[PDB]
C-alpha cells in the first residue's frame, strides 16, 4: 500500500486533484415543472455523477488496495451520502438554495412539487447552512467525502487496512486545522463537529434511499439500470 507512505500535504493534493467535475443538468427552463420531470432531473444527474464517482473512488488513497468485492460494497453503501455531501458543498454559498447543477438551482418551495421531497430538502439545506457557519474548507471537504467512502460500508485484515487509512485521513484533518492557526482544543472540537455531521448525512441518505425506492414502485420516473442496482443494494 502507498496511502500510508503519504504525508498530510500529499494526501490533500491527491484528494483535490481527484475531484470529479461539476456536471450540468438536462434542464430545459422552458419546460413546466412536474413531479415526473423534476425527479427525472435529479435521477438523470445522479446517474451521470455515479460514473465520475467510480473513477474518483479509484484515486482515493487505499481504495485501490481493496478487493473488487469490497469496492463494490463500499460504493453501494455510500453513493448517496457522497452525492448529497457534494450537493451540500456546492450549495454552501447559495443560502436557501440547493445547487444540483449550475443550471439547476432549487429551493424548498420547488421540493413540494414532489411528494416527500420537502423533508429531504430541508435537511440538505440545514447541512449546507451548517457547513457555511462552520466555514468548511475545501481541503476538509475532500477528507470528509473520502471518510464516507471508507466508513459507511466497513461493517458490511482488509478492514484493518481501511482503518489504517481512516486514521491517516484524521491525521490529515488535524494537520489542516493546526495549519490554520487553531489551538489543540479547537482542533479536536472542529474534528468532532465535522464527523458528527456525517451522522446526519447518513440519516439523509437513509431517507433519500427510502424515497427513491418509493419512486421505483410508482414508476413515474425512469430510473437507469445503474441506479436500480444501487437501490437494490440497500434492500
Amino acid at each position: 500500500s502507498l496511502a500510508l507512505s503519504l504525508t498530510a500535504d500529499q494526501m490533500v493534493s491527491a484528494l483535490l486533484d481527484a475531484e470529479p467535475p461539476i456536471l450540468y443538468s438536462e434542464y430545459d427552463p422552458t419546460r413546466p415543472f412536474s413531479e415526473a420531470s423534476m425527479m427525472g432531473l435529479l435521477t438523470n444527474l445522479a446517474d451521470r455523477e455515479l460514473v465520475h464517482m467510480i473513477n474518483w473512488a479509484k484515486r482515493v488513497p487505499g481504495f485501490v488496495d481493496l478487493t473488487l468485492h469490497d469496492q463494490v460494497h463500499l460504493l453501494e453503501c455510500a453513493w448517496l451520502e457522497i452525492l448529497m455531501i457534494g450537493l451540500v458543498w456546492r450549495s454552501m454559498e447559495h443560502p436557501g438554495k440547493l445547487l444540483f447543477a449550475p443550471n439547476l438551482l432549487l429551493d424548498r418551495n420547488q421540493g413540494k412539487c414532489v411528494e416527500g421531497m420537502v423533508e429531504i430538502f430541508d435537511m440538505l439545506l440545514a447541512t449546507s447552512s451548517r457547513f457555511r457557519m462552520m466555514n468548511l474548507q475545501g481541503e476538509e471537504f475532500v477528507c470528509l467525502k473520502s471518510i464516507i467512502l471508507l466508513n459507511s460500508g466497513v461493517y458490511t485484515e482488509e478492514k484493518d487496512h481501511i482503518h489504517r487509512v481512516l486514521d491517516k485521513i484524521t491525521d490529515t484533518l488535524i494537520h489542516l486545522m493546526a495549519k490554520a492557526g487553531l489551538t489543540l482544543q479547537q482542533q479536536h472540537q472542529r474534528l468532532a463537529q465535522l464527523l458528527l455531521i456525517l451522522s446526519h448525512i447518513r440519516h439523509m441518505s437513509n431517507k433519500g434511499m427510502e424515497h427513491l425506492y418509493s419512486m421505483k414502485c410508482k414508476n413515474v420516473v425512469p430510473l437507469s439500470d445503474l441506479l436500480l442496482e444501487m437501490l437494490d443494494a440497500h434492500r
Binding site: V51, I54, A57, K58, L68, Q71, V72, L75, E76, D225, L226, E229, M230
Partner: peptide, 9 residues
C-alpha cells in the same frame, strides 16, 4: 453488476 464492470474498466 454494472458497478463491478465500471470499477475494473
Amino acid at each position: 453488476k454494472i458497478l463491478h464492470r465500471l470499477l475494473q474498466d
